Structure 1
Amino acid sequence: DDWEIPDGQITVGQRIGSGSFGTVYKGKWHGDVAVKMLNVTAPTPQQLQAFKNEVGVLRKTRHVNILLFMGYSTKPQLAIVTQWCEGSSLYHHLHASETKFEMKKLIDIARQTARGMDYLHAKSIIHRDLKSNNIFLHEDNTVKIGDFGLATEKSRWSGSHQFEQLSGSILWMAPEVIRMQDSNPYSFQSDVYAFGIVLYELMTGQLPYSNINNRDQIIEMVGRGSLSPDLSKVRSNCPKRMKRLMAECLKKKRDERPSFPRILAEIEELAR
């Protein structure tokens, strides 16, 4: 309640993108800011609590490669206020842009996002949706990890709506639906895997399985355990140490991936 921004201080600007949740707009508040709004008309007490909890998570981050939480509102609509990034997503640079990156820059980007992720796990925060689209290249040299995935727990945003809209329905739930209620596949190791995919894009310039245009076989083959990215797609000058690190983060069996403190030492060392 210390970070609540009084209303009428922010001048909301141009919409930058939307979602099933709401909208992100550029804004003016002691300078440039991004504003993530939940366009809920009349949030429920439980929706408000789940919002406080997400703000609880964000306010414990303070690191240069994590998008900076600056404040939150609840007065008109639920809102989260962050620093404003200039430039584009890492996805846009790698995949939708003419200009490509030197190897030394790619490794530096890999290093910055390992620092952020190492910082998150040190603080027991799982990102849950790490992808190159969620890595903003601020001023086109500073990684800012943002757009935290939706936590499944009954104390966070999505889990509160999942647990609220099925709270009074369990008596009618087939066993197979019950079992799927409480799930959560997300871990530190799952974060590490996504990071391996982010490395795959940096070091190849492409998205994995660009050769499998079916959401359904990817799901079956990667899930089933027989399909993993094509590492012979890494560029000529990718260091073999970077390739080895990659294969380790991408191991199919979850408890076989490395932790981020080890991941980080490795990249800073090889950047040499």
Structure 2
Amino acid sequence: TQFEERHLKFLQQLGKGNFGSVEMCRYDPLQDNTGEVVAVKKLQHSTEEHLRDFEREIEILKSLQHDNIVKYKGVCYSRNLKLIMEYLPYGSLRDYLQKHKERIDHIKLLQYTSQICKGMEYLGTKRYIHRDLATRNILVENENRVKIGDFGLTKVLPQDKEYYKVKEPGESPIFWYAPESLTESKFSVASDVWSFGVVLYELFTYIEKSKSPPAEFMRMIGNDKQGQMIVFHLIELLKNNGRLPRPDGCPDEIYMIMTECWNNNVNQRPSFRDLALRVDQIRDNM
């Protein structure tokens, strides 16, 4: 069924990014304010290149049906398309964890970790590369469920290759990037696994500001480094085994999972199927 533009009542801005904006809207055809609250994504500056990428993101989201992937609801046509998605009122895992801090125990962080792995494994079966796995891009449905949000940077692997090469990169979350992504702009399941190790780190630091991957990496390379020199030094640091520290109070076993994800050798990084099995075993033991 279709969504009429005239019936989408603006409520609040949710955020802005990669040439798009996300708003919380009430889909109210009855005009009595009893309509469903939905998340609406639209392009801000809609060029023919941006429309093309937006359409691809719509096709990607529509093709995904998993408990740990934000639900596609529809499209609203007025091109200047609007992507309609389910609204998750608890917001991002980043904001949720920052607010609720250590009142969320290790058992609970591992329940979220497992769900992220499962969502990522399912994504990999479709030959999709997320490229922006971070706690800011994970949504909380409720206390017991998290989902991967924002597919704006997702690439589909070529039929004959196991990596996607970005020729002209835009805004990049470099402190979540695998070394081959920094040096050769190569993205794969293995680079998504590297970013997952960074997600696990974020979780176990409970989003403490001084402990964030940009703060830790900047201290390691020197806060005097600027622009492209940050990328140059981060590459050399990663090459010489500089890694994010073990978060305070993080179990040894969870830090080992992070370090395995952060392997310079792309083939030696674990698989998401293995990670979900491993994390479920840790959970069971606890």
TM-score range for the pair, normalised by the shorter chain length: 0.7 to 0.9
Structure 1, 212-221 or 8-17: larger mean CA deviation: 212-221
Residues 19, 50 of structure 2: 8 Å contact kept: no
Amino acid at match of 2:267: D
For residue 202 of structure 1, what is the aligned residue in structure 2?
Answer: 203
Residues 65, 115 of structure 1: 8 Å contact kept: yes
Query: Relative to structure 1, is the Cα distance of residues 93 and 62 closer, same or farther in structure 2, using a 3 angstrom cutoff?
Result: same
Query: Please, which of 110, 115, 124 is the counterpart of residue 112 of structure 1?
Result: 115
- Verify: 1:190 aligned to 2:191, yes or no: yes
Query: Please, which of 14, 26, 34 is the counterpart of residue 39 of structure 2?
Result: 34
Report the alpha carbon displacement of residue 234 of structure 1 after superposing the two structures with TM. 4.3
- Verify: 1:247 aligned to 2:245, yes or no: no
Report SS of the residue matched to 2:213: coil
For residue 228 of structure 1, what is the aligned residue in structure 2?
Answer: 243
- Verify: 1:56 aligned to 2:59, yes or no: yes
Query: Relative to structure 1, is the Cα distance of residues 97 and 39 closer, same or farther in structure 2, using a 3 angstrom cutoff?
Result: same
Report SS of the residue matched to 2:136: helix
For residue 134 of structure 1, what is the aligned residue in structure 2?
Answer: 137
- Verify: 1:270 aligned to 2:285, yes or no: no
For residue 176 of structure 1, what is the aligned residue in structure 2?
Answer: none
TM-score using structure 1 length: 0.77
Residues 124, 189 of structure 2: 8 Å contact kept: yes
Amino acid at match of 2:264: K
Report the alpha carbon displacement of residue 149 of structure 1 after superposing the two structures with TM. 4.6
Query: Relative to structure 1, is the Cα distance of residues 218 and 4 closer, same or farther in structure 2, using a 3 angstrom cutoff?
Result: farther
Report SS of the residue matched to 2:192: helix
For residue 32 of structure 2, what is the aligned residue in structure 1?
Answer: none
Paired positions, count: 241
Residues 71, 82 of structure 1: 8 Å contact kept: yes
Q: Deviations over 1:193-227 (max 9, x none)?
A: 10001111222334236342546565334312132
Residues 222, 228 of structure 1: 8 Å contact kept: no
- Verify: 1:25 aligned to 2:23, yes or no: yes
Query: Relative to structure 1, is the Cα distance of residues 152 and 135 closer, same or farther in structure 2, using a 3 angstrom cutoff?
Result: closer
Report the alpha carbon displacement of residue 151 of structure 1 after superposing the two structures with TM. 4.8
Name the CA distance, whole Å, in 1 between partners of 2:272 and 2:148: 15
Amino acid at match of 1:17: G
Query: Please, which of 98, 103, 107 is the counterpart of residue 106 of structure 2?
Result: 103
Report the alpha carbon displacement of residue 141 of structure 1 after superposing the two structures with TM. 3.3
Query: Relative to structure 1, is the Cα distance of residues 209 and 16 closer, same or farther in structure 2, using a 3 angstrom cutoff?
Result: closer
Amino acid at match of 1:185: K
Report SS of the residue matched to 2:84: strand
Name the CA distance, whole Å, in 2 between partners of 1:91 and 1:151: 20
Which segments of 5 or more consecutive residues in structure 1 lack a partner in the other structure?
164-182
Alignment identity in percent? 29
For residue 166 of structure 1, what is the aligned residue in structure 2?
Answer: none
Structure 1, 198-207 or 216-225: larger mean CA deviation: 216-225
Which segments of 5 or more consecutive residues in structure 2 lack a partner in the other structure?
28-34, 159-164, 170-183
Alignment RMSD: 3.0
Name the CA distance, whole Å, in 2 between partners of 1:79 and 1:270: 41
For residue 10 of structure 2, what is the aligned residue in structure 1?
Answer: 12
Query: Relative to structure 1, is the Cα distance of residues 152 and 76 closer, same or farther in structure 2, using a 3 angstrom cutoff?
Result: closer
Report the alpha carbon displacement of residue 55 of structure 1 after superposing the two structures with TM. 1.5
Name the CA distance, whole Å, in 2 between partners of 1:67 and 1:84: 9
Query: Relative to structure 1, is the Cα distance of residues 11 and 202 closer, same or farther in structure 2, using a 3 angstrom cutoff?
Result: same
Report the alpha carbon displacement of residue 31 of structure 1 after superposing the two structures with TM. 1.1
